[PDB]
């Protein structure tokens, strides 16, 4: 039992791993199905069909990169559909010829709600599919690991400039401490973007946002947002500049800041607004 890719790379008897490079639809939208048909690239055959019958399965299938974070999916195997990423071993396909035949595997991937812009970037790992080979002869249990990579960028249609999320909540370590804030932006057409913060501050510099908490609130402290090592006062335009189909981080970091008194224990909460400026 051996396998081979359409682009040369093969896996001999005993199992092993191989990198597959697939072409993907450069544009796929919500409701539409991105199809990664692997029955045209991964092939397998039986080396001793006169004495041994091979049994092959899609043992496990995992999603990576943009598929894991922007796509919901199912997998086609020998005519039947299963959840993707897989959660159970599929029924077996019989291999009984020396003639290399297609491994009946297809990926059906639909964009999620948060998808937009470059969902799957070029050269990135999109999937890992584990083939499992056995037989009625031996007790051979071989694994053929297939690392599915995208050859090209896959763009989810977007209109204008859209942000990562609308509600981003970040939790701080116990005082004192800091946290990165996962916030991105992508534009359909490359546009010059800026942004400013909004809210209620406690300091003259208008940078330390007040602890809005009204449960067990901690006094003395507040939250201060920083970027590139520099504190960002409220109502202060930070220009990101050229922003296109690739996500551009706002580079925000939540910190504790001192009001001008003495810190007491309790909850801390600040609601900070982000507003984008165009051109």
């Amino acid at each position: 039992f051996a396998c081979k890719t359409a682009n040369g790379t093969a896996i001999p008897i005993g199992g092993g791993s191989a990198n597959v490079y697939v072409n993907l639809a450069p544009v796929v939208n919500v409701g539409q199905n991105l199809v990664v048909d692997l029955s045209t690239q991964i092939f397998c055959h039986n080396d001793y069909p006169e004495t041994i019958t091979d049994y092959v399965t899609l043992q496990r299938g995992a999603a990576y990169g943009g598929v894991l974070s922007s796509f919901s999916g199912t997998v086609k195997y020998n005519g039947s559909s299963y959840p993707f990423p897989t959660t159970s071993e599929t029924p077996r396909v019989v291999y009984n010829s020396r003639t290399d035949k297609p491994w009946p595997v297809a990926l059906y991937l639909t964009p999620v709600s948060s998808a937009g812009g470059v969902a799957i970037k070029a050269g990135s790992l999109i999937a890992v599919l584990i083939l499992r080979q056995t037989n009625n002869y031996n007790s051979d249990d071989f694994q053929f690991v297939w690392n599915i990579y995208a050859n090209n960028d896959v763009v989810v249609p977007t209109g204008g400039c859209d942000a990562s999320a609308r509600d981003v909540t970040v939790t701080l370590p116990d005082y004192p401490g800091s946290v990165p804030i996962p916030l991105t932006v992508y534009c359909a057409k490359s546009q010059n973007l800026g942004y400013y913060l909004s809210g209620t501050t406690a300091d003259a510099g208008n940078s330390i946002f007040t602890n809005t908490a009204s449960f067990s609130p901690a006094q003395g402290v507040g939250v201060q947002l920083t970027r590139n090592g520099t504190i960002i006062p409220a109502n202060n335009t930070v220009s990101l500049g050229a922003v296109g189909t690739s996500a551009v981080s706002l580079g925000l970091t939540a910190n504790y800041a001192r009001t001008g008194g003495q810190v007491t224990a309790g909850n801390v909460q600040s609601i900070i607004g982000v507003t984008f400026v165009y051109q």
Binding site: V168, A218, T264, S270
Partner: peptide
């Protein structure tokens, strides 16, 4: 705001 950031913290004793 286009995005609202909620920042949860806590001070222990």
């Amino acid at each position: 705001a286009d995005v609202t950031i909620t920042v949860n913290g806590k001070v222990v004793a």
